[PDB]
């Protein structure tokens, strides 16, 4: 394409032995991979990514969109609980965004898998969960990055069980937000957002708080539902009354307090990732492996 060279981060194509369609592709595929020598003195080890491309009906638009999420990884640097960008392939052919690979698909999936009728999840499983997507996001805030959409579909699985949270630089125009579409599971995304993002269009770091206190609710209900069965037209009603989700079974009363502070209904009031992360600490070394 029109793309500026970046050694930085610049990939032969011959490196990189593409697979099968990874989910299918929203605004934009998906692919699972394999890069040779991603590792500049292991040139011959391969390892499983994940790459982003364009669409044969893509605009110009959406290509500026995916090198801008490109762009932004690339500045925002590594977490351990982020996915993080690995290299690219932008010369002679089609745009190649190559991140790491999460083999055990989405945070509400992983989830979902392991509840009681695959082993399953200790308590503090559960809460170490919380922990590391905590610190994820108290990283990303580091940064001075706004994800806008925190949640369990957002964040990812490694094999090794390492929460990743993805699409931190997702390009995306609110002032566009289809209230009424759902994800490609039927949920309503304006059930994550803040109350100042929902109604004045206000996204800041704390609005993130409050998704992570959706996020918190969605682990300790083993990948639940947020408010089943409710439409947007009475989610607004609900918020404007200040409702908040019921407390999930088999749920601390610690915690269920830490998601309502999330849900502060003042942004000032609520807690910040690095409390959170404290917090979570603390919590995890006091809750027991035996369930
Ligand atoms: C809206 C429907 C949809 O697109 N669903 C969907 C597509 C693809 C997957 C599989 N999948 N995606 C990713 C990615 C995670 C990230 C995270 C960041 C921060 C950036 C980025 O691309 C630049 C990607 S791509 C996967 C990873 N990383 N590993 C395995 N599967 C992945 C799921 C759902």
Redesign the pocket.
């Known amino acids: 394409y029109e793309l500026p060279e970046d050694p930085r981060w610049e990939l032969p194509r011959d490196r990189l032995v593409l697979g099968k369609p990874?989910?299918?592709?929203?605004?934009?595929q998906?692919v699972?991979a394999e890069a040779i020598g991603l590792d500049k003195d292991k040139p011959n080890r391969v390892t499983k990514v994940?790459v982003?491309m364009l669409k044969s009906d893509a605009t110009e638009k959406d290509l500026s969109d995916?090198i801008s999420?490109?762009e932004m990884?690339k500045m925002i640097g590594k977490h351990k609980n982020?996915?993080?960008?690995l290299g690219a392939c932008t010369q002679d052919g089609p745009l190649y965004?190559i991140?790491?690979?999460?083999?055990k698909?989405?945070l509400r999936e992983y989830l979902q898998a392991r509840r009681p009728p695959e082993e399953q999840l200790s308590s503090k499983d559960l809460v170490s969960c919380a922990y590391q997507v905590a610190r994820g996001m108290e990283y990303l805030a580091s940064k001075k990055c706004i994800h806008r959409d925190l949640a369990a579909?957002n964040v990812?699985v490694t094999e090794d069980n390492v929460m990743?949270?993805?699409?931190?630089?997702?390009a995306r125009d609110i002032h566009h937000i289809d209230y009424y579409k759902k994800?490609?599971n039927g949920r309503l995304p304006v059930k994550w957002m803040a109350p100042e993002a929902l109604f004045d269009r206000i996204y800041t770091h704390q609005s993130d708080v409050w998704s992570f206190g959706v996020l918190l609710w969605e682990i300790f209900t083993l990948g639940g539902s947020p408010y089943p069965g409710v439409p947007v037209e009475e989610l607004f009603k609900l918020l404007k009354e200040g409702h908040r989700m019921d407390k999930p079974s088999n749920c601390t009363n610690e915690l269920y307090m830490m998601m309502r502070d999330c849900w502060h209904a003042v942004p000032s009031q609520r807690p910040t990732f690095k409390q959170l992360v404290e917090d979570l600490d603390r919590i995890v070394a006091l809750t027991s492996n035996q369930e």
Do not use: Q
């Open positions: 990874l989910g299918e592709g929203c605004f934009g998906v699972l994940a982003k995916l999420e490109m990884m982020i996915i993080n960008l965004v991140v790491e690979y999460a083999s698909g989405n579909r990812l990743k949270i993805a699409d931190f630089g997702l994800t490609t």
